[PDB]
Amino acid sequence: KKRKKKSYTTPKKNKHKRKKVKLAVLKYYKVDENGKISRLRRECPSDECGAGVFMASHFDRHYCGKCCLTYCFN
Amino acid sequence: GHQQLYWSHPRKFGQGSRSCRVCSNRHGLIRKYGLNMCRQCFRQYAKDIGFIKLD
Amino acid sequence: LRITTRKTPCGEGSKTWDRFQMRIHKRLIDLHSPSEIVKQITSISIEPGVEVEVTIA
Amino acid sequence: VQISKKRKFVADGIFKAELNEFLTRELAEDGYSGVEVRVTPTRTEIIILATRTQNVLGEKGRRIRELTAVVQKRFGFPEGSVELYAEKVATRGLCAIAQAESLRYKLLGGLAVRRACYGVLRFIMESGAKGCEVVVSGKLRGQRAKSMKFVDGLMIHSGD
Amino acid sequence: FRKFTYRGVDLDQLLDMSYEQLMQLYSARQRRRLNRGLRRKQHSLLKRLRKAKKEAPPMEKPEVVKTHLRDMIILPEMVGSMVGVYNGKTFNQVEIKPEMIGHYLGEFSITYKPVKHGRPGIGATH
Amino acid sequence: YKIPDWFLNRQKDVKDGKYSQVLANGLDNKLREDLERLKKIRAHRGLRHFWGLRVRGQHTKTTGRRGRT
Amino acid sequence: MLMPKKNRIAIYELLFKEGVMVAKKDVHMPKHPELADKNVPNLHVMKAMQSLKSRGYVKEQFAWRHFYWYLTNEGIQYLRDYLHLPPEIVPATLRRS
RNA sequence: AGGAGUGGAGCCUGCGGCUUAAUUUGACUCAACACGGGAAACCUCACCCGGCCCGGACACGGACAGGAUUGACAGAUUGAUA
RNA sequence: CAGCCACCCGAGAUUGAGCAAUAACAGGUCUGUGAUGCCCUUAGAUGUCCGGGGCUGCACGCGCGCUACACUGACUGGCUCAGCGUGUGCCUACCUACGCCGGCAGGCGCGGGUAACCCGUUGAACCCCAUUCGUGAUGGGGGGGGAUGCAAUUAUUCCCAUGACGAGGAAUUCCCAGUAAGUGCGGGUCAUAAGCUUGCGUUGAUUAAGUCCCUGCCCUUUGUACACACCGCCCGU
Description:
Chain D is an alpha+beta fold. Helix content of chain D is 41%, strand content 19%. Chain G has a two-stranded antiparallel sheet. Chain G starts with a helix and ends in a 14-residue tail after the last helix. The chains are: A little secondary structure, B mainly alpha, C alpha+beta, D alpha+beta, E little secondary structure, F mainly alpha, G mainly alpha. Chains in contact: B-C, B-D, B-E, B-G, C-D, D-G, E-F. At the B-D interface, loops of B face helix 1 of D. Chain E binds 2 RNA strands through residues 24-25, 27-32, 35-36, 39, 41, 43-45, 47-48, 50-52, 54-55, 65-72, 84-89, 92, 104, 106-107, 109-126.
């Protein structure tokens, strides 16, 4: 066969791009009328994950990988 | 989920992976007696085991 | 046992099936004897190439 | 516990084929001459012999332990079930590999193939062999791959 | 005029009541959920059929449901979806109807016109 | 003599399930003509039969001169 | 080379506690023969092997579907430096001369 | 001299141009067709997709170390399963 | 003389294969192989991950593969005979006695054994037919389903149906006594045989003890301006 001229569709994909602050600000949340850090997010009883994983509140679907409970805000 | 992301396909009739082990090829394998050797090396190690020809 | 092997990998030339023979020969002996005597007789650094197995059924 | 004969004979053929191919792959540099395997009750062993006896035996035992570990770990052998015996040379009824290696490692360091053919021929017929043939296949003078076969002595091909 | 029905049972009759009567008479192609085992990939497929037949508005052609490694069809509930099979270049378009039951949905995939009834090879006089 | 249903000639045939031994010209062959549905749904066999291609694996790559001159 | 390093240090530690080790090359296996009941991806370890043999520290050898290591003084010393093994360990293969 | 005497009729994996990307060759008239000892959706397609890992060690450039294959859930989504 | 034929004898008055020149073919195999003629080989995909359409698609188109092709025989069974093929595997898991539902498998403990132990005296094949088909294309080959593996599909792999051919396109096919064919038993994929193949039985034969014709190879003599050797050399417009 001949070379397909692989530029008409998807010549090559590039690595994932994200915008992250050098020191995390999105993972920790402030403003709870406390002099120290206050954990407003309810802890999950599943300890099979890592200690540095921060539990988030998503509007739709779940992205955990092993347990993925079902809940909503209503 | 994880079972469709990767490895959703087995091969239970695999002969290519479970081919003649001692050299690197699939052909020249017969499953009797545990040969796992091509006919060329079958002859090269025939008389060593005790093989003789009279027919 | 007969084994038969084509040699031309691709079809080119005659169908010279290498016919090799594996002829195994077997001898049995059943003994009613004291163990020590036959053990001394047998375990005498037997010849290589002949395979001996002792069975009690 | 009982096993048949044909199947284990073929399995031993597998083991023999792999060990011999690995042996001819590596040990061709250190002058080995004759290699065999032997069996003792519930015990397998590999034996080697050469004109370079202690050289093939190796320095620091590196070859012995390394290859014995290789066979032990590959062929399902329980640990320790392989050892090396000893022997000696009877006569010169099997003298080909010494001169073959000599010519090979003269050529590897820079030497004409046919000068080596002359030397190996003359040494082999000084040793007392009846006849010898050396077929070098490839390109020796020009880009035509002629299978330069050199014969000397008698060669029969017919009979029991 | 007269409509065709399979053993006198129409799409509503096959759809409303489950296969408690077809338990013994269920066809081949992964019937072995009792003799060999049970497999996955009918869960997100169920979710996606729910999604495709839940948000669909009437009087338009529904969403293209794309299959490369063709899925198994287990019930005619999925009737009403425009299926695009991967023939390699375009969409193999299938509009499912209750007459598709007991088949492989990839069976309507062809990727070659019949060989042109034109000229033979150069050396045809042998 | 109590012929079984699976042993019966029109066993679990299409449209209607009838176990009566009735033989009349004009409509019986039409009952045998259940091919209407298979050719109409243009299934795999139907899409073969559109042009007249074999459906049982008979290797007729260029053979088949019986009746085709 | 994309295997998480914990398996790398585990393999190196078992290597030096045993000496040489064997390698079977195949992607269709579910679980490693000798390393069974662990679910280790074979592709990553294979890349690690070809990287260390390309890095020039163990003599690279392709031998007919079944791979072994090549142990030497330089290889053992480099493994000791790379795994930071204590200056008291001696392999069990050199026991009693 | 004579028996099947083939092919004549639907009657092997391979098989000639073979329309489509494809039903192709690695063998070409006693040296290609039971050919690589193929019960062909595969390891019982080499010509086909895309997710599947992106083999770079060895002088050294980049913030002169965090540039995440590996983490699935009814809208994104060249299979929602990446 | 080497020898040859017949006869008397004898189990045998030539049984088959095995090994098989010197030298070469500009042969096959890197698709048995990481040494080897190689522009995309900067790890851009042939498989790693998917298996859809088909070498199952159609016209002389090269391929032994074509069982059977009918009163010699197709039916149903009264029936009576060695395969001496072989069939339980270190990271092996694929070979129904005792009782029954059944058209196959399906099994509930369950295929007796690592084998001359267990399949076994392996009742498989032309046969005294155990209803029918006394001369004709006919009784003569002859579209839904219940279930090995991830998926029966152009039925790969069991149940009822809607039964060309005349000894057959002109056809570089083998064969001379247990041999051609028939038929049968198996082994190569083994998730259960193989439309071929490889071994072995059974039934079992008519011409031959010769010759270069028409086919190939070989030898001697002879001619040659050929030696890359007639697919040569070479002359003229």
